[PDB]
From Swiss-Prot, chain B:
Residues 1-39 form a coiled coil. It comes from Severe acute respiratory syndrome coronavirus 2 (2019-nCoV). Subunit of the fusion protein that is processed upon entry into the host cell. Mediates fusion of the virion and cellular membranes by functioning as a class I viral fusion protein. Contains a viral fusion peptide that is unmasked after S2 cleavage. This cleavage can occur at the cell membrane by host TMPRSS2 or during endocytosis by host CSTL. In either case, this triggers an extensive and irreversible conformational change that leads to fusion of the viral envelope with the cellular cytoplasmic membrane, releasing viral genomic RNA into the host cell cytoplasm. This is Spike protein S2'. It comes from the Viruses.
UniProtKB/Swiss-Prot annotation, chain C:
Attaches the virion to the cell membrane by interacting with host receptor, initiating the infection. The major receptor is host ACE2. When S2/S2' has been cleaved, binding to the receptor triggers direct fusion at the cell membrane. When S2/S2' has not been cleaved, binding to the receptor results in internalization of the virus by endocytosis using host TFRC and GRM2 and leading to fusion of the virion membrane with the host endosomal membrane. Alternatively, may use NRP1/NRP2 and integrin as entry receptors. It comes from Severe acute respiratory syndrome coronavirus 2 (2019-nCoV). Changing residue 8 to I: In strain: Omicron/XBB.1.5, Omicron/EG.5.1. This is Spike protein S1. Binds to host ACE2. RBD also interacts with the N-linked glycan on 'Asn-90' of ACE2. Cleavage of S generates a polybasic C-terminal sequence on S1 that binds to host Neuropilin-1 (NRP1) and Neuropilin-2 (NRP2) receptors. Interacts with host integrin alpha-5/beta-1 (ITGA5:ITGB1) and with ACE2 in complex with integrin alpha-5/beta-1 (ITGA5:ITGB1). May interact via cytoplasmic c-terminus with M protein. May interact (via N-terminus) with host bilirubin and biliverdin, thereby preventing antibody binding to the SARS-CoV-2 spike NTD via an allosteric mechanism.
C-alpha cells in the first residue's frame, strides 16, 4: 500500500509544473494561470506593499 | 439597502456542503462526470439566497 | 521538484486506485503545498479499511 | 530560579495567515494568548 496525501491552497507552492510557461502581458484582457489559480482579467503594476 | 446587498455579495464565499466555493478550482481538480454533485450544492445555495 | 504521475504506471497494474480529493486523470496539472507519502504491508482483505 | 507573578496585558498577536489584507477588520478563530491573564 502506498498513500499520497496532498494539501492544496496556501500562499506558496511547489512540487508541480510538468508543463511549459509563456511570456507576460499587461493592460490586455487575457486568460492567466498562476500555479493552478486560473481566471481572467487585466494585469497592471501594483502598489500593494506586501 | 447596503446591508441587503452586502449580505448577498458575501453569500458567494460559502461552501454549502461542497468542497470549495470557486467553480474554476472544482473544474480544474475533478472529472466532469463527478463534478455535477459538487456544482449542484452551490447552485441550490445561490438560488435560495 | 517536478512530479510526473505517469512513471508509476509502468511499475505494475494496481489492485486499487481510488483517489479521494482529486480525479486521477489530470494529476499532472495542479500544484501542491506539500506532498507526503507512506508505505506498509498488510493482508488483502483489510485494504477496505484504508 | 525565583518564581513570581505578573499580568499579561495585550501581547501575543501573530499573523495567522500569509494573505495580504488592507483597511479591513477581519475576524479569526484560532489559538491566541488570552488578554489580561
Amino acid at each position: 500500500v502506498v498513500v499520497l496525501s496532498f494539501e492544496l491552497l496556501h500562499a506558496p507552492a511547489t512540487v508541480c509544473g510538468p508543463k511549459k510557461s509563456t511570456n507576460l502581458v499587461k493592460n490586455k484582457c487575457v486568460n492567466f494561470n498562476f500555479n493552478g489559480l486560473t481566471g481572467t482579467g487585466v494585469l497592471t503594476k501594483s502598489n500593494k506593499k506586501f | 439597502n447596503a446591508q441587503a446587498l452586502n449580505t448577498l455579495v458575501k453569500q458567494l464565499s460559502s461552501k454549502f456542503g461542497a468542497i470549495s466555493s470557486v467553480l474554476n478550482d472544482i473544474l480544474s481538480r475533478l472529472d466532469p462526470p463527478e463534478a455535477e454533485v459538487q456544482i449542484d450544492r452551490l447552485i441550490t445555495g445561490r438560488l435560495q439566497s | 521538484c517536478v512530479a510526473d504521475y505517469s512513471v508509476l504506471y509502468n511499475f505494475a497494474p494496481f489492485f486499487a486506485f481510488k483517489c479521494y480529493g482529486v480525479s486521477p486523470t489530470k494529476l499532472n496539472d495542479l500544484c501542491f503545498t506539500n506532498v507526503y507519502a507512506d508505505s506498509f504491508v498488510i493482508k488483502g482483505n483489510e485494504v477496505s479499511q484504508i | 530560579t525565583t518564581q513570581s507573578y505578573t499580568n499579561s496585558f495585550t501581547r501575543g498577536v501573530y499573523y495567522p495567515d500569509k494573505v495580504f489584507r488592507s483597511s479591513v477588520l477581519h475576524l479569526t478563530q484560532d489559538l491566541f494568548l488570552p488578554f489580561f491573564s
